[PDB]
A paper describes a structure:
The Tn1549 conjugative transposon propagates resistance to the antibiotic vancomycin used for severe drug-resistant infections. The DNA cleavage and joining reactions required for CTn transposition are carried out by a transposase enzyme called integrase (Int). Most known CTns, including the Tn916-like family, have Y-transposases that use a conserved tyrosine residue to attack a phosphorous atom in the DNA backbone.
The DNA (named CI5) represents a sequence from previous in vivo studies in Clostridium and contains the conserved left and right 11 bp long AT-rich imperfect inverted repeats (IRL and IRR) that mark the ends of Tn1549, connected by a 5 bp homoduplex crossover region (atagc) (Domingo et al., 2005) as in the transposon integration substrate in the recipient cell. (A) Close-up of the active site in the wild-type Int82N-CI5 complex structure shows the same architecture as in the R225K mutant. As before, Y379 points toward the DNA at the phosphate of T-1/T-1’ (at 5.2-5.8 Å distance). R225 forms a hydrogen bond with the scissile phosphate (T-1/T-1’). The structures superpose with RMSD of 0.5020 Å for Cα atoms in Molecule A.
Author numbering:
A (entry chain B): 82 to 125, 128 to 165, 169 to 396
B (entry chain A): 81 to 261, 269 to 394
DNA sequence: ATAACCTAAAATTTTATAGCAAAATTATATGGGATT
DNA sequence: CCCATATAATTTTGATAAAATTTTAGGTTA
């Protein structure tokens, strides 16, 4: 009979969720509890737009305000199933998308970025980690999850069958795909292969660690335990800021561990790699995400291709 | 309460702004409902059992799989509206047709390059159908919808830049007669050399000006423009004559749209670069075009990932 | 004598989707330890 | 400045039918 109580019921309905979801839901539950639109009766469309106006004034980005709306709309979708859905509208009207464009790295930047890492006495230890990302386009947690079992040196193949993440409290835990759709095999090039060989040959001080039958992880922290998402993201934040201070052409504002995946995917799509073959290596279930890396065509473009394949 | 017939009828007025083909498509279902025992059942007393059982009768009656799956959507939206007005609690048509029925739909097989340049050679020689040769080369070289080909006029073409302007389609339905219902296509030399021939060999044009459109490129025997039915019916005769002159017959499902299927496929398997096929085909979503692309395995990626 | 065309009629197919949030990645404040 | 980590914010990612086209039955004509 209130909004805050409503979202609590929607949370108890679909309980089978990962750990990060529970955190993300609590953040929204904290927002509803800290706003006037959280103490009102569900039976009491204009206020939802006003709520969207306040979240924009809080400082939260467009998508952050957008994703939350979808959760509330589902909560009222079930409520109406059990008036009119007050969150049934387009956020594009109330607020504008001030989202930052994730500009990839130009081949000149990468050749200068890697050289900096290699020649930097502080971050040269992560060089082998970065090269593989620009050769496999692995997700950052997929990289941290790799063990000696998931590598095929003889056949040059990376078996991506899991991901290793760590959260506050729960600690380390292994996440796996339900069906065999998640599993994919990524081929190693000479740069990637010889990078893994250096990681294996230079691994030392691995403290005793086993989680759900996984051990001998490749990338470990200085504290003895494997690297996590935060450990690599925070390293990038320091590395890029150090690169920008010594290089005029500062790296893109989105130069994050995921941008290494951006750059990888964008390259192949530009070089004319098979769109479905790219979808596999990327691990996209829906082809739509992969096709976003491909440039929008024109008449001249469509004509050129027709004349190229005539 | 009210029956299903009265609910589907009420859902028809609520959503009126529909084109003629829709009305025809909606009327067929309304005939089915009146014919079926389901149409007389009160909306409230319709259970998931009754909804699934209806799908069985449709197949037993002879209807194809995709036919029953579309009518399922037309009826689901009706109960959905009936559920929105709080007439009833749950929607009986919320289930997968794959569980109750099998998808025995004929696979739409496009023409292989070997079949293509053997099918064209037959048209160019057969006295009865060489008049349509120029038209087919266009359908295969442009990948147009069949009514959109009928719509093409002298004004739509641009021989200077060799581009086709597709902005409309010409339709004909019983009673209404003819009626007109947004992309640009590059014309290859083979398609252009056909287009220049169609105009130079066009005559006996009747007076025809519909919705601001006149001088259609492809005309029937009676001087009036070709329709969708006239081309499909022509293909039913053409294919049957090919199969007698050749041992290895053509695909059973070879139709005007198969000439489009063949174009997109041959383009996709040629590796046509991004979304330019999507632009040349004219799909709203990119997902529709990717269906014309072959499924890739690990081996397909291995060779493609070579650099 | 058989197809070849035509048309009303009944059928099949083509085409259309953001988004009725989860679940990841990234940024930051804090604080201790190694460097310039 | 590096590193680790708790906290928090941002990003990345899972057909509630219209409107066409195809086929077919019946008839005439080449």
């Amino acid at each position: 009979m209130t909004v805050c109580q409503l979202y609590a019921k929607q949370i108890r309905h679909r309980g089978n969720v990962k750990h990060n979801t529970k955190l993300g839901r609590e953040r929204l539950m904290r927002i509803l509890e800290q706003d006037r639109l959280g103490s009102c009766p569900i039976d009491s469309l204009s206020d939802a737009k006003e709520w969207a106006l306040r979240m924009k004034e809080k400082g939260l980005s467009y998508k952050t305000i957008n994703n939350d709306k979808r959760s509330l709309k589902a909560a009222f979708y079930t409520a109406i199933q059990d008036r009119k859905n007050p969150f049934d509208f387009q956020l594009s009207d109330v607020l504008d998308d001030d989202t930052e464009p994730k500009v990839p790295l130009t081949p000149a930047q990468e050749e200068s970025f890697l050289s900096f890492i290699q020649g930097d006495k502080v971050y040269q230890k992560h060089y082998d980690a970065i090269v593989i990302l620009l050769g496999t386009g692995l997700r950052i947690s997929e990289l941290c999850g790799l063990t000696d079992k998931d590598l095929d040196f003889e056949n040059r193949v990376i078996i991506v069958s899991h991901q290793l993440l760590r959260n506050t409290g729960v600690g380390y835990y292994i996440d796996e795909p339900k069906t065999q759709s998640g599993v994919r095999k990524i081929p190693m090039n000479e740069e990637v292969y010889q990078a893994f060989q250096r990681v294996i040959k230079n691994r030392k001080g691995a403290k005793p660690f086993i989680i759900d039958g996984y051990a001998n992880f490749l990338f470990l922290k200085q504290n003895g335990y494997p690297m996590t998402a935060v450990d690599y993201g925070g390293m990038f934040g320091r590395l890029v800021k150090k690169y920008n201070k010594s290089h005029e052409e500062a790296l893109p504002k989105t130069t994050t561990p995921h941008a290494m995946r951006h750059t990888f995917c964008t390259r192949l799509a530009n070089a004319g790699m098979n769109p479905k073959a790219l979808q596999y290596i990327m691990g996209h279930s829906n082809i739509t995400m992969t096709l976003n890396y491909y440039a929008h065509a024109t008449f001249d473009s469509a004509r050129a291709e027709m004349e190229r394949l005539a």
